[model samples]
Target chain A: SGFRKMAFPSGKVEGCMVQVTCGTTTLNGLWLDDVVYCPRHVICTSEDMLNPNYEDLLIRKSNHNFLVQAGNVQLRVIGHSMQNCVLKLKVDTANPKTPKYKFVRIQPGQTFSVLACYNGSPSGVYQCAMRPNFTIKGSFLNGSCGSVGFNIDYDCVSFCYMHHMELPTGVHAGTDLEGNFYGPFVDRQTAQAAGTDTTITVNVLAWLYAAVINGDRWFLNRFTTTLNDFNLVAMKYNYEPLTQDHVDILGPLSAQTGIAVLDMCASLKELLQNGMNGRTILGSALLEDEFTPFDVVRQCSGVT
Target chain B: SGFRKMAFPSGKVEGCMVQVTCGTTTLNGLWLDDVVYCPRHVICTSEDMLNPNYEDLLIRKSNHNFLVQAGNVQLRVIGHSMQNCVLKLKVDTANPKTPKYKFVRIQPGQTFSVLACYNGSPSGVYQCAMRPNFTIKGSFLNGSCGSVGFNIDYDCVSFCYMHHMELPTGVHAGTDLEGNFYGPFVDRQTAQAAGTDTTITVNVLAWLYAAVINGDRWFLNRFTTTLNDFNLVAMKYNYEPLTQDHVDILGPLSAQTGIAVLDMCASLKELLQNGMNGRTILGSALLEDEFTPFDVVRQCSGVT
Candidate 1:
């Protein structure tokens, strides 16, 4: 009931081709010059023209049946199903002096919709319904039928936190920093009670540096790429010795490189604590008559 | 027969308790409590306590001297020629007193212990010895001073899974399907590829559902204590309906959960065919299918 002129982003309200009002703008500019208010036109086939009452005849019968009007043409049958179904359109009375009809087979769960286009009909009715057919062949789909297994083995277990290691189930064990296999720790409490005396502790930061420098080539590449970006930003800002917040920002770089840095920190610590390296590096020292003070050595050597 | 029997948990044995024996009984009770017969005691006194001639003399010339009990006392002092070495002892030489004496200043690094009790007579030739005042307080104790911090935070964080609700360093968010807030997936591809739909899914059976039902009162109290053990077991065991071997099992449950189940089936299909979730879930599904279905899903999931 209300109309207004419409404008484009360029602030141009003229020459807009849309009909009716758009927001506060009316698109009736073109109709203003039309000969005596010419109405919008509709186009249809002969069959549609014959069915003057087409739009009024279609009725909703059930879950699948509904009287659908297509440009004023009515249909007797309108429904769908996942199983095999049938659409039978028929007519009665004398031929030549009678109505004609057609039909099609339908599946209950077809991915695409079915649109029925027809021509003709003085008076006829359509019937559509699914049939009981266990033919498993006509159409089939296996969306994610076996997805769980796939997820479990490859997706979940392949990259899960417990991958390749067993702890919750049994003893915790792994290679220590000194490259020794150790463990059988039933719980974290017992492992910790042993402390440095029987635990090989790896300075996480030191491990990262070592991994990048000498252990993992992949780590080196990724770390260097991040470091380069870091240096670039630092240079642009006239910064030196990346500050705390700067390092915080770089935290995402770890994820981008496919590393669960935090998870690894804990995992690695577990390895060092209950692993063989723990006994060799830390345990041996504890058992010795003299305490050599590893931290003093570490501090002096700049290993931390 | 100075032998005394040990007592049990707390059955006071019929016997006499002496005053001197009170402290002795306290110590004896402790020994008895330990399931072992331990016999040892210490006795000490004043200036005789403070460098008090310590114990009877077994002279080890040139350094500090001290009589010792095997398996008890321990010490070490190397002989080094120094400024002054003197022995001061009062001996009555024809007048009951000539004030005979000598002295030595002790520097650090001198390893020796002070004893305060003995078992013989007056001139049992008491002895004590000490050497060069190196004053090398140098090698003192550094009792795992750095270990405390190393352990305090690391151990706590390593073993505690609920360290935070956030991602490595952010907020946590997830669908509250069961009244629980699950995640802010650091890696959605990993998660969906790991699938149960945006959450880490465990085949409840593998995790022992009973524990949550009966053992963890919190879980039963939360999940549905209303579900009796049988219903719970049925609900849980039948939940293998969520199983991989069971989605095969569930192809039917879909008919039961209504069209929504099938809709999910088809939806999952479209996803597997063209969606990211599809690629991950379905691809990973394929990879784990033959156990090789893992990579198929990994490849399909686009996770790596």
Candidate 2:
């Protein structure tokens, strides 16, 4: 029986067994070890063992080399076999987490050690965002047949980004790892909410006048520093006081005041399209029907 | 000099003036009586020149024919133009209403007119819209840098249809008479405002209820209807009571929960864009810098 020889990258060895006999044919149970060579020396040895045989397999990953040192001399293992070319294996894993251990037919598995790294710490709400980099499965409306309607699945998570850092006021980073930081357009609540979160909190009403109230600038500085990564897109937190002076300057509502809605939303796109056509989006549930005596009576007098 | 003849589009006559001969080719003291057509047998001649002119103008406007009887024969006035027709100018000293009048320019201005007469009259808000549609012309911070802004020209007039005989309530058909109806967009104010002048108040109210009360269905109908019209892009109205219901269905404090603010004055196109962008026009005044007290205090306090 002929014996096979194998090697791997990483320049390490597990077992390199070989079987041999005489030139023609003979016995087996032979092994090649305790071999040595001069520095910068190359050695290519292969043996053919007939009958009873003993073989050793040395495996390594791809693009890496292994060295078996016997004193000043070393055995340079060249791994060319596809199975032992494990560099390609790591590449195949292609995952962020560390690849688990691999072993031979009867070898044991290897576990990787956890790394301990520290991120600079800062307290309070920080504006962090990752630009659109997410995948979605698909959206669908579930229905059986005709007259069956209105069951849509948007799954906004498909359009969300994940963050490594935590938010000061929101849920843990793990739980709050979703949602869009900024949209291309404007909405009433989310914009207000984002503005709310970007501001600082006060422990006491007296503290409001104490000083150091400019939370937007502070958070903005931190946000800029933290979002060094080019992928991030954090919106600027604007700070301005709401006062009668400002309102008075804006002028009468019917006088074509300067406080254009487009400026506030950072866009006039909506106005251009709708303004020309004379329409708007009504998104509140309150209707004239809600005020009907029927609903009022129903609420006051129990059932229908 | 030779006398000149000019043509005018039917609707351009302003002052009451009949045939006037121009140019240097004039004979002194030429007494003119009945203006007769080439077809003398089909027309009638009269001294009431203004009435004839007015009748001729009315006939031209109605796109009909005027039959006349003159002397012992009858004549017909046909077509918008009478080819180089000569008119007998009568210096009637007897007629006081036919006081001396001069022929000004022989041209007409391009005036817009109603093409089709409708039993179901349509009405809409009439307002002076800014030219160059998008962006404001005058501003302080960024004065006329081609920086576009939308300023509501408060010169708005609400017009409505009386019996359309074609469509349902809350909607109307409009045409340009003095100016234009200007808009038939989904008016947030009209939709949410008290239907003070609605003739079919109950029917229109029912349609409104269907929209605001049954929002999803309303959205489907209204959105589809809006999409059908190229001019209309968006619409905004207040559905206040549905806020909690939407929140209950979609989740609290979410943009998906319709809106917390209603926009009662946005145009259809702009409102549609807001809907597309997931925003509500919101009735709240467009603030200068759209700032809150907390934001200003926080930013300023830090400096102090």
Candidate 3:
């Protein structure tokens, strides 16, 4: 979980939901589709970013304002039932190069789909949370924190975005008629023994490197693109490698980083509430309540 | 908060909301009226139970099965939108006196209001929670339970019931036309300083004594009984005293026991969840999930 300290006008409040281009990959798949788009903080891997491997681009989230590298990232408040209706996103730019791009307020019917690696992986984490800097403290395992640092702990999630296009190769989606994705599977031994379809595969952390690898500028057009719809499947026939310089730049995680846990199946709203209360300390710049403020693509691109 | 361990059929689950006769009370009077009927546990006080004072009765709650003393308190499933509905309550009684009064599940539109003090106060507090055994631990005051037990502390509230007739002498409801009544208040100095209507007065723990004191036994009739409607107002010419023995039973508080704190505006659903996880320990027979399994007035009457 991450926290960011952004200032909005005093007294008024607004928030909204965002989705990335990558459709959900399987994770702890229950017989039913488990992750009906719940809260999870997905980010891009550095390894994929540099090699431009076009792999594991995921995002459980987003944040803002990097007009240059990420293109024109604009958001508007299209509240279905406007609580305090004010046109949310209006660009008042004096200069095209560094124009004013501000989107204030949020509600339903007013969300813009974001490309996973909008600016880059470095920008997605908790920095741009639905409600940034959210964390929860408790011991879910063994009921209390013993030695493994499990008990009496503080952990968090963000109301992050997801992708319609970020799966690697042979990952199966949840077996619903709609091809509902999001959960990879937790305990599938029973399904395995039964020789039936069970989803207990890998939940690769891939959000950032995804869109860039596709070799297209992530403008607003991804919205109506049917390229990554239900019939979309990823089946890479061979393993690919990235250059050393790129690998050094795009720091990747070992496999098995995004596993879902029973306790973590906590509701989305809970994280929103907690994160607000869990705002990070500016002094503790090196922290996790983990609010990360997103930067423009070239800026957060991790390369000159 | 209190905890009660009632046995429901395993697996399938259901829950619902319950309301006592009392509407909201004005507390911490903001510029606007506050306490929109949130979470609070109400109980019958031993002091009022005997005197039958008919004063200070309340509940912010309910549980079940007291065919006797409290009469056949029946609840049934009237789910407008049944999720997993299976006729919640059905009385299959062979014997009338000790008939079987069983209510199995709950959902919206399937609630039955009780005439507080049904089985008496000893059984109300956290004993019959919306979901029993619910408690939350945190130092809300200083943000940690400290020496005053204020730092790093564990406290709770219950989805208790309230009464239409529970208010004591001279307490006003919210300023809304609906005459809302819930909060007794926190800080109303501004309203007071302004020489306008301010709502910082008293929040007496008066749920239990309320229903019984109303003269008529709190059966179902209280529903249509608009006796304490918006035109409702309590004004006793003089303070009535109760016998020592009666007061000894209801065990009324020295007033000021039910003050609403700012930190406690936590949502109702949060408590339902925490209380479930915070299930009480039988070893600590004394606790607050604080869930209390309600009993027949006679059994938990705290007296013969």
Candidate 4:
């Protein structure tokens, strides 16, 4: 008998194969690549080729998109779909030497805003990437949930900018990138290169000098350019020779002089000759010449 | 029949006109002005005149009074009746130059506290008045809401003192008014007058100088006589050069400079500066200038 088209007792059957045994005449089913066939008025497709057990298990594409916004020392990531998905964001991914990555699990229909700072370079272009994966499996979509065993790589990448420019001695400047301004970098090299020209160093020393005397950072942060200018200058000039301006800046030592502690780190004997008045004051009954004003200021510079 | 005084059907009626219509003979109602009267065995009042439609629409006096209390920068007004009323407060109402007025709506049985600032003469005297008006209308006390049409002007006026005394150079003072003290007025004349006498200026300069060096406003608000003794010399010496005695007062600027910013603001700045340095060193490689002797003193300041 010729093959005849047939229908099943249940609803439409797809992606599966069927077999029937009439008494001793048994007919084996054939694979039809999700096409329907009839055997004794029964319709059936391939035997759920992907999942032989669950014939109705459907196949769906797990494609997702994300929106990423770069912020100053930060990053904003927003996913499109509200599904149980895993998202990974990597900074400087193009660099084979050092690449930092962050992983976040976004619930169905949730947005992620992540903030991060530069790993190294003060100012330069860096690459960032976003990857999303959805591998959930099992039946019932709930209790039997498991990894779907699928990975979708969006590979969303962009360029991030970090601008850190050096400024002039005693004068600081800031940079504005994409409406966000950062820094008032004070040039430490210029201050150190001044050699005998003490005006620039005086201004720098004046601020740190007062900071030490007061055991506070007011002199540093407020008088110096930018937030970290004081430490920046101190690290560079702590070994340099002290000057008369530095002495004048610290004035006559007293009970509150910061030099006692500062002298423990750096010596002030280099500028002591030119700072006789300050030396006399430090040698007075108040300080007993325990340390020079330069030493006091340097110590006070980082007091608070 | 003869005229007779009688009570009303409900309870008591006051301030109303009454009449008795003897079987079509219209006897015009008489206003007893808050008195109860009788008519043919029936007790009635002004309900027949104002609103004969509803017998319950009774006549009542809408007189209102308000109690007012004047404070340093605010006024409290409380009324006897909790009705929709208009409150008007005027300051220096007698002044032809600039008379200020403020108006507010007082809900039935509510109190209104008004706040205002002085107009001129930092320290002087001014007049204030509180006038309340009740203009409720309509019937049922509920649906019939209108102005009571009564004005009670409580002329509670007084001389408000404004003290803006000029202090000595570098010295600031304030007076306690109504349990509140205001001012840190820096004296400039004394500094200028002590032209040749650098001592007075030195005291002034010492506080300001220290403040500037430390990049703080503490020396300005502090050091003054009322707050501290740093500038007591400036107030006494209008013409004397700064001596070691003046220097001794400033003592030494150290980690314990302010136990309070050392108290609050100054403390916040110090904390902020510390936090920033901590953050910078964590994020950058240029923070080798860390942990000076000041760090040791800072630990001591906190220990105390």
For each candidate, how many residue pairs have backbone atoms clashing (under 3 Å)? 43, 68, 112, 53
The residue-by-residue lDDT of candidate 2 on B97-159, one tens digit each, is 221322211101111111011111100001111111111111111000000111111111111
Share of true Cα-Cα contacts across chains kept by each model: 0.00, 0.00, 0.00, 0.00
Residues B1-304 of candidate 1: C-alpha lDDT, one tens digit per residue: 0000000101011010001111211111001110111111111221222332212311322323312111122222223111111111111112111112111222111111111111110000001111111111111111100000000010121100101011221122221111122232221212221112211112222111211211221211112111133233334322212334423433333343332222333332332234232122210211111111121122122220
Write model 3 residue lDDT over B1-304, tens digit each, in one string: 1111211110010001122211222111000011112111112232433333222232222223111111224322111110111001222222232211222222111111111111211101001121111111110110000000000001111111222221121121111112222233211111211112211111111222222222212221212212122112111211112223322333332122221211111211122223323121211211122111122111122110
**Chain B TM-score of candidate number 4:** 0.17
Error of 4 at A30 (Å): 70
- Rank order (by TM-score, best first): 3, 4, 2, 1
Model 3: per-residue lDDT, tens digit, A1-304?
1111211110000011112221321111001011112111112232333332122222222233111111224322111110111001222322222211222322111111111111111111001122111111110111010000000001111111222221122111111112222233211111311112211111111222221222211211212211122112111211112223322233332122221221111211122223323121211111122111121111122111
lDDT by candidate, in order shown: 0.18, 0.17, 0.18, 0.20
**Residues A1-304, model 4: lDDT tens digits:** 0000000100001011122222222222111222111121111123322222211221221111111222112222221121111112222212221112222222211111111111110100011111111111001100000101111111211111111211222211111112121222221222321122111233323333443433332212212132133334344534233344444444554234544323422222223212223122211111111123332332232111
Best by lDDT: 4
What are the runs in model 3 whose C-alpha is more than 4 Å off?
A1-25, A28-304, B1-304
The per-prediction i-RMS, to one decimal, reads 46.3, 41.8, 25.2, 48.0
Interface RMSD of 4: 48.0
Segments in model 2 whose C-alpha atoms lie over 4 Å from true places: A1-304, B1-196, B202-205, B208-304
Higher-ranked by TM-score: 1 or 4? 4
Worst 10 residues of 1 chain A by lDDT: A2-11
* Native contacts present in candidate 4, fraction: 0.00
